[PDB]
Amino acid sequence: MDVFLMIRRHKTTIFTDAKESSTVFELKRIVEGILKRPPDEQRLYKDDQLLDDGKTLGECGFTSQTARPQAPATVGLAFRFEALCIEPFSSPPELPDV
Amino acid sequence: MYVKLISSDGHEFIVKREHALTSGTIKAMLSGPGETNEVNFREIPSHVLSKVCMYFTYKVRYTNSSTEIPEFPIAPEIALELLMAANFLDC
Amino acid sequence: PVLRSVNSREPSQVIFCNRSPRVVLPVWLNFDGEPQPYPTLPPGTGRRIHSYRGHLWLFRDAGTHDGLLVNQTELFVPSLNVDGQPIFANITLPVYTLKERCLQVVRSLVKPENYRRLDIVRSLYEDLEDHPNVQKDLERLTQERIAHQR
Amino acid sequence: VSEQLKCCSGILKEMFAKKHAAYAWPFYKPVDVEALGLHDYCDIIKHPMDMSTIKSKLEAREYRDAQEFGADVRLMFSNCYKYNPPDHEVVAMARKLQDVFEMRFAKMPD
Ligand SMILES: Cc1ncsc1-c1ccc(CNC(=O)[C@@H]2C[C@@H](O)CN2C(=O)[C@@H](NC(=O)C2(F)CC2)C(C)(C)SCCCCCCNC(=O)C[C@@H]2N=C(c3ccc(Cl)cc3)c3c(sc(C)c3C)-n3c(C)nnc32)cc1
Structure with missing residues (x-):
């Protein structure tokens, strides 16, 4: 079963999919392939919660229902280690009258 | 393999090339007349472009389906800005 | 016919x-x-x-x-x-284009007489007022079968 | 009785024949109330009946004489006449099929 993730750090955001049976380490291998940073130099969080490299994405709580294409699940990313800092997206304006 | 979409307010969105080509505008911007990896949008903010990238993954994922697809959700708040973006991007 | x-x-x-x-x-x-x-x-x-x-x-x-x-x-x-x-x-559901999907949500929130009061381009007004229609689609499908048979 | 029930099978066999299909087809299988979108058939028609059900009762030897078999064939037609107004196309079909049945059933050995 496929899980659709949104890997985030500062003002960067990576849209990628992964198997539920896939491990947290295999996700660091994808981040490396994109942002050119060995896996030992990165950490992955789920709402201020460190993820072990041995654990699978399913065991971390990312499931088909949680991490969907139209509504992907957020994964925190940090380099070096720096404090986890995800800049929030801009605010939508007030619902226009009508 | 991947492409970078940049919003009006800095935010960078790394997205699979095959996903981003869902947009006629993006397809035209980083193809050739007769090629680039980055595309900057001066007038599309984070909260919109993030939703557009979600649409790309949704569109690529469920065009291949044949049994049942889910609704693509749009919060009333984003509806107006996302329309104008969808018009500009031709998707 | x-x-x-x-x-x-x-x-x-x-x-x-x-x-x-x-x-x-x-x-x-x-x-x-x-x-x-x-x-x-x-x-x-x-x-x-x-x-x-x-x-x-x-x-x-x-x-x-x-x-x-x-x-x-x-x-x-x-x-x-x-x-x-x-x-x-x-x-x-079809995989609606993001455009046609957004029109649906804007139509479901705004009354047809108020489409004109939305701060958008004139081409999005004419796209909002062009409601999905059975008579409209039947015309398209009729011509698709003419070219398909020819 | 054995020879009369052999006739009945022969009558029913002919009612299923392709030459009669043009007007016999509504009465082949039991009335599917969901498929026909009817919310009242079960109130009006207490005892549903059809040629498929009759064929089973014939092979299962549930008809003691030919007069028990005829009663069920007439029930089938009665149900159709009872539920539908006379101008409905299905009634015209029921009559054309009953014309066939009554003609053969009237030449029953005794
Ligand atoms: C509930 C619902 N939700 C979403 S869709 C739906 C739904 C509701 C009703 C129906 C019923 N089906 C139709 O309306 C079909 C669908 C479409 O293909 C068009 N259609 C017709 O029935 C068309 N008629 C024909 O093609 C013919 F008549 C030329 C052969 C219509 C729309 C032009 S006429 C059908 C509307 C009139 C309904 C009469 C209501 N009465 C009955 O159904 C009594 C029933 N009639 C019939 C019957 C009706 C017409 C014919 Cl010349 C012969 C028998 C009947 C049986 S048993 C059996 C297998 C049938 C078909 N029957 C018996 C015996 N006794 N009564 C019956 C289907 C879906």
């Missing part, structure tokens, strides 16, 4: 299956090509249907008249039940 049901009296046992989150309004094209509304199917529900060979069907959102797919096409025409086996008609 090009897209119409043939008046065969050859029965066809069908199953309509609503696998959309919308309330579905089935539309039978009668023998003159005029569209007839049938009772609506709630979401996730299915039911047995008595129809006939060469009868044209077409499915819509009961509320908004947004087009829906049936076995990944716009039109459903029953075959003859081989060994009395039912013909399945699986009704689903």
